Symmetry: D2
Subunit: 452 residues, 4 copies
């Protein structure tokens, strides 16, 4: 039915099949579908996730209007997601005023002030990171990074999102690790969205119950044992209250949505970085020299000395341009609206193809090359903040951005203070993106790790 | 799941069964369930249509807040209804700004000015009403009113909602009558609301297609033949334009929702009136004398002489108190709100039990008796407009109220100018309400019709 | 998922899309899809109605095995159909032993003995047929046949399937006609077969209730008024009893399934015949001369004189080859089986493309031409009864075949005894088949009717 | 709808609620619902799982007819179960001829001949059982049996169902243990059975994919490494072939269904036994003396010496009467049939309430007491094999019964050769059954373990 919408508005796009819409075209991945539509149709285009019209926009004014100017009034929420259960109280999933409240209640937790108090927690698990790596480096065996890096990203989440301290790699049998390790079906979510409500009254939760049952009680253990500078405690202090306080269940739901947002992003960006540092050894040396300058004698990184490292920042940012691991941003259009000369009707999903804008030859020279100088203070100013959006933009951007950048930077400083990384015969050169759902390598990153 | 809500808020009500909620209790009808809960639980109570929490309110302040003060801000829409298809553009079904627009676009059509121009159309089909009745009165055979009255209510709808002129009783084979006569499943709508969206992508429309296909083309015939003072023409003139104009499809959807709202209401109220006039012959005589006074020599009623008839008005109103044929009013609570001292959480349905307030001994003496003096100018002032609500109240009340009152009044004046109505041995005394869905008699009204 | 089946077996066919299978290819109609697959892939091919594998077979041995030899053992039922409700007791819909019983209980009703007793009923409504036609022939106005023919097919069904006698064209307001005239959504039945069971527990019946409620009571009126040689009475006599008797509800369900099978088939074949007789006037004259020979002085047809008419038989049969209005036959494969050298796995639907075999140049010379001599006693023997199957074949073939042939033949004899039929400027020459579901003309048949 | 069935047949039972049927009555558990209906309604009764009629039968003749005489003809399959995916090829889930084949293909694997070859595998993991227990016995800490016993039941399954050898308690990090440890929602399966097919086309498998993906490949590793006397190898030898061979996928599906059937049954019976041996210390001593007699000097048990132990057999059997952990047996009635004087219509589920027959005072004196002498050779003969059915009866009974009895007996001999078991203050005396789904203790069994 609703497949006639874009034709009437005169918006171009690929013709949709009945029921499926355009979803068959996701067979080369979201990344390649988006690049092709940018190429074929120019500045705007429309496709259909099943019956759901999606309008893609690439003009930086329009993007600003949607992400900033008309965020509260028109473009407040992302695509409706389910079946969720009580996770409807997670900030990323909540809508309209419930989100606005949740955002207000959680924002003091992610300030640079609070982030400086967490850096000694984040630091200690970098030590754990190196001593897991040195065990594989002294054994002359090429390293699968996602395992040592995956363990780091999960380690930092426990101790910051619940206060629990695990060497998940070597304390694998902690009751905590096993439950938090319970991190395809979502294509049917789309040809058959009418089925989400079925599952909701069936208590078929996308977040399994035993885990959510554990953390609820496990936080209700810690809440009633203190009664530490982790997200848990910063949230327990906020509900010691303007809007209402954060109910016990809501504080759990936020913790869980942090784990999810933080775990595989941090792991994948870190792997993407080390792949680039190994295939661009010059960039690696220059970074190691900066780390040794700011931190002589392999001094431990601190909040302030991290923010001192400009090339490290340049490497991280250039990597997040190549691999914006969320790939897209979305907002549901909640009202009939006109923006920067374009009528947009109610219920359309508006989408910003980050990946494709990050690799748009119209804004970047040699967009496939890993050139960190792009982000040099001399050249950084000629970058558009609505073209480069690895963490989104506007009131609903990534609230954990500052933390995620410190966290990865702390990982890298220490791992580069100790090791060098070289391609193995088993390294996938060139790295190929997973034609599948999330932004991750086809083949995992394997490299030789030697000890300075 | 959501069956714990009212307990937490400390709102009383009948305990719900899983999945079903309280729906098993509708076995004696909505009317008796509501009276019992008013009796058992006082001024507010909560029940569950399956999983859907419904909060009943009976304080006239609170009712005013919900229906008037916080209508636009909080309580704007009725229970979500489907699967509807294109009838999503009908004003009664549209929500929020789309409704606000539609209401603005249609309101000039229902003014007392426009109503006076339609009274000669409505009048001519009263003539048809009498000559169908005189045929059954000259044949010494007790009359089933819903047939002669049903034919009247449908007759007035055609000529006012599309311009077509049919003696539906004696021109039964008109292509128009057969399609418009395509006026249980809605209990499953409620234990299984998750199934509405299934039907929507299945084009399973609650309003069958051929009819809606006919009127679309049939209005697109009349629109392109004129290019008359019916609702159709008053709507064709409005789209000759503040909001946007009323799209061709939208004008059809309004016409259809008028037929629906107008047909069985007008038929049932008229039957309820004649049942009361026959079991209260004094009231009938006194009305016939008023009709003969204002209209000597059986003069034809006009707009102004109808508004002159105060007892006729008193009869109609007293009847609509006994039989408020919509029974309830509803608004979905769109925000967490507090009203007249009571927190009401988002997504609750708020409900005003009209029938039960209309028969609440706390506001009416002998509420079961048919006493039209209740509405005497002497006594009319001591009536609360939020207790007596046969047409609702506030910005979303019955937009066709003035028309519906003229229409029934025009029916009655003429039918009483000519006939008297007496109970037959087959009359159901006392009339019993249909324990089933809509407000209508168990047994249809049969009476003896004699000719003055 | 199940889209890999035919590849493994090495059966050719069009590649299916996910979820949809091959259904997009029905856009030129079942008839053209089948002819193309016969052309492209030879003697067997496979396609998918959504996830449902369908195997097409065209070898007359194989067809015999499926329709006859292994009917009871393997290929007993047609595609599961719903949501049906109590019509699960109709013989066409019942499965396995319940069907075998029903077939036994109903078979004496369709004998040539019983058919001769019904011919005077069928005859009288042919008279009604002519006098509806003569009214349009004396008015110099081209005739839409499906209206006069549709009225005939429905007339004969009432009086034979319930005993009721209506000139439906001129007694349109009979309570009986209106309910029996309550004779697209079935494509979703197939991409979403998982939804039939939903509707079943929702009492969403494909046969609406009021009709089925009427006939149940209306037969329970006639059953309790007699307690006539119609199907109703022949069924009331059978339940006056080997298997069990035919429950009251079952007798209704059979009556309804007869109406359905008999109404639009008889109407459409009759229209196809008259279209061919008008575009082949030679064939019409030769038939009129045979009718006048056997029946001199426009003598009324009888059972025996109908069976005397060999060219009339030749015309009817040749027409049913051109337009086999069921188009296909189907059986679900209930066991893993091998037949005439071919493994066929459980749950596959096996399909005989009648239309396409009826127009297969490999068995018919000039298959598009209307050549009734094909069925001449000289040439009739060289016809394969598993290639020509307008009524199916084997234990589950059309049980009402003998009746349907008499019925149409009786229509034609009388209408040709009185009128000649000539193409009008508004006749669609050449007739185009409806690219839509059932086998019927794109445009309805309009012709000039003159009076001998 | 179908809630009228038992009334018509004159079968008594609890009146069902719409949609839910009788399921609300499962709130005290299946065990108590069944005992109450046996008490209230006598020898047969009917209830409804939602719309699904279930007929309970308790006459031992009738039970024999259903389980034996008419197994192949009428009562072949259990309740249809889903959504399953490829596990449709598991023998317990397969139906009719596909089951009959699978049963034939797997039956040589469960002979007493093959069982004697596996006893040295089963034995070695009893050693592992004791040395896990001795660690908790030397630490003066009451033992949670389900952990040490759960680890035993899973240990024996790996090495016999795939050949893999793990001390799951102390090798917890084996890639094999973690995947095999991926062993509520099924009440909705029943009010909404119409939803199983939805999930099937959604690939929503009740057996998660990664596990089933692992074992498929992991067996395809072992199959292609040998190419040992485990079930895997005995099945690899069978497909080296009457029916067809066991496809690669089918052999996996059987292995998985063995794990499921074998894991929690063996763990729970073993816990039930040790609870009874600790609350009946006399029975424990008498068993320990028999074990020491047959096996002097704590000799290791063998196949033959296990079958020598008559009291050990008496203890096990008496326990399985108290706690028949499947609780019920079921067969779908596939045909209208009459059995031992009782019409049973097609599609009814027929159910044998094992638990309730095992505790029926009409067949057992003091049925709540743990009296192993019931099974003494003197008294064993007066036991009805259709009243006592811990493993079912007839062609579809528990195919792994002989193995399950050896397995538990081997556990017990060794654990009693070494330890004595005494109630702790934390022991739940009397043990209460879990009012929830499967037959297991409310509270897990904790006891003091001392070392002989
Ligand atoms: C390198 C790591 C990460 C990347 C690349 C990333 C990316 C993103 C993006 C692109 C968005 C959507 C922005 C928008 O819609 O405009 C987002 C949202 C969000 N992220 Fe991050 N993210 C990362 C790590 C984290 C971490 C560590 C947290 C820890 C708390 C976090 C918490 C959130 C939340 C709560 C939201 C939704 C905010 C809202 O809905 O108001 N993310 N992330
Ligand atoms: C005696 C006859 C009638 C009665 C007792 C009646 C009663 C009602 C009631 C109780 C409501 C809801 C009010 C609320 O929610 O506050 C309503 C709404 C409505 N009625 Fe009437 N009605 C009658 C006839 C008519 C007629 C003749 C029309 C012709 C146009 C009509 C058009 C509508 C519409 C469009 C609405 C919804 C308005 C909106 O959603 O904004 N009704 N009616
Ligand atoms: C010219 C008119 C008709 C045509 C072309 C036609 C065609 C067919 C065909 C092709 C089948 C399926 C045969 C098979 O699957 O092998 C069938 C089945 C059937 N027909 Fe006819 N039909 C006609 C009229 C009628 C009439 C008048 C009746 C009146 C009783 C009737 C009753 C049935 C029944 C009950 C079945 C299913 C039999 C069973 O399932 O055992 N049909 N028809
Ligand atoms: C003490 C342990 C066990 C108990 C109490 C138990 C009980 C049962 C029962 C009551 C049945 C249904 C019988 C019927 O419907 O008549 C059954 C079926 C079955 N069991 Fe066991 N079981 C146990 C262990 C095992 C084990 C260790 C296996 C290992 C292979 C196994 C394999 C099966 C299979 C395949 C079926 C279904 C047979 C078929 O459908 O043909 N079970 N079990
Ligand atoms: C769970 C949170 C949501 C709904 C999906 C996310 O998180 C994941 O994708 C986790 S993927 C995984 N599952 N299991 C394992 N090991 N990894 C995304 C994609 C990502 C973190 C970036 C943030 C954001 C919003 C914009 C997005 O695009 C998503 C969050 C906040 C979303 O609200
Ligand atoms: C209702 C009966 C069924 C299920 C469909 C039929 O009947 C129709 O198609 C009626 S179509 C219609 N609907 N409304 C109006 N006015 N016409 C078919 C197609 C046809 C009669 C030939 C017989 C058979 C079996 C083989 C078929 O192919 C069908 C019957 C017996 C089927 O069991």
């Amino acid at each position: 039915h609703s497949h006639g919408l874009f034709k009437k508005l005169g918006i171009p796009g690929p013709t949709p099949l009945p029921f499926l819409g355009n979803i068959l075209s996701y067979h080369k991945g979201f990344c390649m579908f988006d690049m092709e539509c940018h190429k074929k149709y120019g500045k705007v285009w429309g496709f259909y996730d099943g019956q759901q019209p999606v309008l893609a926009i690439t003009d930086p004014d329009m993007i600003k209007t949607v992400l900033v100017k008309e965020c509260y009034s028109v473009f407040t929420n992302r695509r409706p997601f389910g079946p969720v259960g009580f996770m409807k109280s997670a900030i990323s999933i909540a809508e309209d005023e419930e989100w606005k409240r949740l955002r207000s209640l959680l924002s003091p937790t992610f300030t640079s002030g609070k982030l400086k108090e967490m850096v000694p927690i984040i630091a200690q698990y970098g030590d754990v990171l190196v001593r897991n790596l040195r065990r594989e480096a002294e054994t002359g065996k090429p390293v699968t990074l996602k395992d040592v890096f995956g363990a780091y990203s999960m380690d930092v989440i426990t101790s910051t999102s619940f206060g629990v301290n695990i060497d998940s790699l070597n304390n694998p049998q902690d009751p905590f690790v096993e439950n938090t390790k319970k991190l395809p079906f979502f294509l049917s979510i789309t040809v058959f969205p009418f089925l989400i409500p079925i599952l909701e009254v069936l208590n078929i939760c996308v977040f399994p119950r035993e885990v959510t049952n554990f953390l609820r009680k496990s936080v209700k253990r810690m809440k009633e044992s203190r009664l530490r500078v982790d997200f848990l405690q910063l949230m327990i202090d906020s509900q010691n209250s303007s809007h209402k306080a954060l109910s016990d269940l809501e504080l759990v739901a936020q913790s869980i949505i942090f784990i999810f947002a933080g775990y595989e992003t941090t792991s994948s960006v870190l792997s993407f970085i080390m792949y680039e540092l190994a295939t661009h050894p010059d960039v690696q040396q220059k970074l190691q020299e900066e780390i040794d300058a700011v931190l002589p004698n392999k001094a431990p990184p601190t909040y302030d000395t991290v923010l001192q490292m400009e090339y490290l920042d340049m490497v991280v940012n250039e990597t997040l341009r190549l691999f914006p691991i969320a790939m897209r941003l979305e907002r549901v259009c909640k009202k009939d609206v006109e923006i920067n000369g374009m009528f947009i009707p109610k219920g359309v999903v508006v989408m910003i193809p980050s990946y494709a804008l990050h690799r748009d030859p119209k804004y970047w020279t040699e967009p496939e090359k890993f050139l960190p100088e792009r982000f040099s203070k001399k050249n950084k100013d000629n970058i558009d903040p609505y073209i480069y959006t690895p963490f989104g933009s506007g009131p609903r951007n990534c609230i954990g951005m500052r933390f995620a950048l410190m966290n990865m930077k702390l990982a890298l400083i220490r791992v580069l203070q100790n090791f060098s990384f070289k391609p193995c015969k088993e390294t996938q050169i060139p790295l190929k993106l997973s034609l599948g759902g999330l932004l991750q390598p086809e083949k995992p990153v394997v490299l030789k790790v030697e000890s300075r």
